[PDB]
Amino acid sequence: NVRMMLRRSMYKLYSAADAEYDLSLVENFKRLFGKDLAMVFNFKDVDSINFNTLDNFIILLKSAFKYDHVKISLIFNINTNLSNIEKNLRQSTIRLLKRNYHKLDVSSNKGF
C-alpha cells in the first residue's frame, strides 16, 4: 500500500543520507544535509505490482515537485509488451508518465 511505500522510500533515503519517515524528510533534506536530492525509483517488476497502489503512489510523488531542490526519475522493468501497462494504470497517470519518457529494449535476442 502507499503507506508502506512512502515509509520504506523515506527509510532508504535516510539510510543513504546518513551513510553519506515521510515527505517532510524530502522537504527538509537540504536544510539537514546541505545538498540537493536526486531520486531514482527502480520498479524492479511492474507486471507483479498492484497497479492501483502504484497509480496512487505516483500521484503522491507528484506533490514532491513543489520543492526546488528535488528531482525524480522512474525506471520501469517490463517483461511483456509496453501496452500491458496501459490497460491497468489509469489514464491520468499515463499522461503524467508520457510527458518525459524513454523506451529501451534490453533483450538478448536483439537481431541475432
Binding site: R3, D47, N56, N79, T80, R95, K98
Partner: protein, 416 residues
C-alpha cells in the same frame, strides 16, 4: 471586520460565501466550514486566491494528500500552528512543545490549550483559520473521523484570545450526506461547463505555451518579420479551442486531461507551422489533421512468443471460455469474466490442439506465461503453484488470442 473579495471567475457565489463565514472577529465566524466539489472544480485555487488578498487573516495550510494517515494530520496541525504563532507574534516568551508528542486528539486539544494560554497576554481575541484541503482524499479514512474535528473547539476554553476556525474541502457527495443533520455551513462547487473550461484554459495556459523554446526556434527558422505579441496570442489561443472541440467528448470537461493533451500535441502542431501556416489557422488545421484524429494518450507482432507458448495460451483461453460439458464431445460468454479451470484440462487440450508429451519445456513455458502474467491464479501472496487449491484463468483478451491463432494457423473461430 470587512473583508475584500477577489474577482474569481465562475466562482462568484462561492467567493461571496467565503466573504461570509470568514472575518476578523471570532464571534462572527462558525466553528466549522465545508467547501465541497469534485476534482478539477477550483476549490483549492479559489480558497488560496481569497486568502491571498487579505493577509491579516491568519491561515494555516495542510494537505491530507501528503499526510497519509490521521497521525500526521494531527501532528502537522500543532507544528504549523506553533510555527505560525511564532512567525506572527514573536516577542511573547513561549516554551516549545514537541509536535511528535501529539498521539491522540485529546493531546492535540491539550497542546492547543497550552499554546493559547501562553499567548493569553494578547490584547484582542483573534481567529486562527486552520485549513485542510481534500479531507476525504485522506487514504486511511473512516466515517467516524470527521466528527472529531467537527466538535473540537468547544472543548477549548472560550476565554482564550486565539480561536481556531476550521475550514474543510471535500470531493464526494456521499461523504457530505452523512453529516447533513449538523447544519454545517456548506459552499458547493459544481463542475464547469464547456464554455467555462475553454475560457479557463485560454486565460491560464496561453502565455506559458506562447513563449516556449519550441516556438523560439520556429519563429527564427521561418524568418517571421511582421510578428507581434497579439498574433502570438491568437495563434496560441486557436490551439486550445481546436483541442477542446476535438477531444471534449473524450476527456469530458476536465482541465487536467486537456492540459496534458495540449502539452503532448503542442510541439508537433508547432512543427507544422510554416511561413504560410500563420495568419491562416485553417491551413494549420488542414495540415496537422492526424493530431486531431487520434487521442495520442497512448504510451507508445505486439506479443512475440514461442510456438509452445502460443498454443498453450490458445488452449488456456479455450479452457477459460468453453463450458466443461463440451470437453468430451467437441475434441474427441465472451463478455463475462473468464471462468476458472485446472491444469489437467489445459494439458489435455494443448495435447489435443498442437500440430508433444510432457517434456519440461511445456511447463517452463507455462511458468513463463504466469510470470508474464498472461495467465492468472487465485492468489496474491506466497504463490504455491503445487498446492491443489490454486486454480487458473486467462488474463488475455480475445483480440490477442485471435492474432495468435492466425500466427499459428489455428481455427478457434470455429469452436464457438
Amino acid at each position: 471586520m470587512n473583508v475584500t473579495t477577489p474577482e474569481v471567475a465562475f466562482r462568484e457565489y462561492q467567493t461571496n460565501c467565503l466573504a461570509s463565514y470568514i472575518s476578523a472577529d471570532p464571534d462572527i465566524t462558525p466553528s466549522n466550514l465545508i467547501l465541497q466539489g469534485y476534482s478539477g472544480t477550483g476549490k483549492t485555487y479559489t480558497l488560496k486566491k481569497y486568502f491571498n488578498a487579505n493577509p491579516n487573516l491568519h491561515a494555516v495550510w495542510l494537505e491530507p494528500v501528503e499526510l497519509v494517515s490521521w497521525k500526521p494530520l494531527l501532528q502537522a496541525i500543532a507544528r504549523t500552528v506553533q510555527y505560525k504563532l511564532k512567525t506572527l507574534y514573536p516577542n511573547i516568551p513561549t516554551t516549545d512543545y514537541d509536535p511528535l508528542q501529539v498521539e491522540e486528539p485529546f493531546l492535540l486539544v491539550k497542546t492547543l490549550h497550552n499554546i493559547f494560554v501562553q499567548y493569553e497576554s494578547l490584547q484582542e481575541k483573534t481567529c486562527l483559520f486552520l485549513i485542510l484541503d481534500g479531507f476525504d482524499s485522506l487514504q486511511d479514512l473512516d466515517a467516524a473521523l470527521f466528527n472529531k474535528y467537527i466538535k473540537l473547539n468547544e472543548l477549548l476554553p472560550k476565554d482564550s484570545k486565539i480561536n481556531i476556525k476550521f475550514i474543510y474541502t471535500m470531493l464526494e457527495t456521499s461523504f457530505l450526506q452523512r453529516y447533513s443533520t449538523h447544519c454545517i455551513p456548506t459552499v458547493m462547487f459544481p463542475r464547469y461547463n464547456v464554455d467555462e473550461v475553454s475560457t479557463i484554459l485560454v486565460m491560464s495556459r496561453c502565455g506559458e505555451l506562447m513563449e516556449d523554446s519550441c516556438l523560439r526556434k520556429r519563429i527564427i527558422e521561418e524568418q517571421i518579420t511582421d510578428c507581434t505579441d497579439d498574433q502570438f496570442q491568437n495563434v496560441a489561443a486557436n490551439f486550445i479551442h481546436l483541442i477542446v472541440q476535438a477531444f471534449h467528448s473524450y476527456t469530458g470537461n476536465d482541465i487536467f486531461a486537456l492540459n496534458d493533451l495540449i502539452d503532448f500535441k503542442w510541439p508537433k502542431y508547432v512543427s507544422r507551422i510554416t511561413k504560410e501556416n500563420i495568419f491562416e489557422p485553417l491551413a494549420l488545421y488542414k495540415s496537422a489533421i492526424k493530431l486531431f484524429l487520434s487521442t495520442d494518450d497512448n504510451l507508445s507482432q505486439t506479443y512475440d512468443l514461442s510456438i509452445i507458448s502460443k498454443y498453450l495460451l490458445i488452449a488456456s483461453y479455450i479452457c477459460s471460455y468453453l463450458e466443461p460439458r463440451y470437453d468430451a464431445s467437441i475434441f474427441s460468454p465472451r463478455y463475462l469474466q473468464p471462468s476458472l479451470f485446472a491444469i489437467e484440462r489445459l494439458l489435455a487440450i494443448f495435447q489435443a490442439i498442437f500440430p508433444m508429451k510432457a517434456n519440461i519445456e511445456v511447463f517452463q513455458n507455462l511458468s513463463e506465461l504466469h510470470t508474464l502474467k498472461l495467465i492468472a491464479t487465485t492468489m496474491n501472496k506466497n504463490i504455491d503453484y503445487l498446492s491443489p487449491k490454486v486454480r487458473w484463468k486467462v488474463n488475455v483478451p480475445w483480440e490477442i488470442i485471435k492474432e495468435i491463432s492466425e500466427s499459428v494457423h489455428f481455427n478457434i473461430s470455429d469452436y464457438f
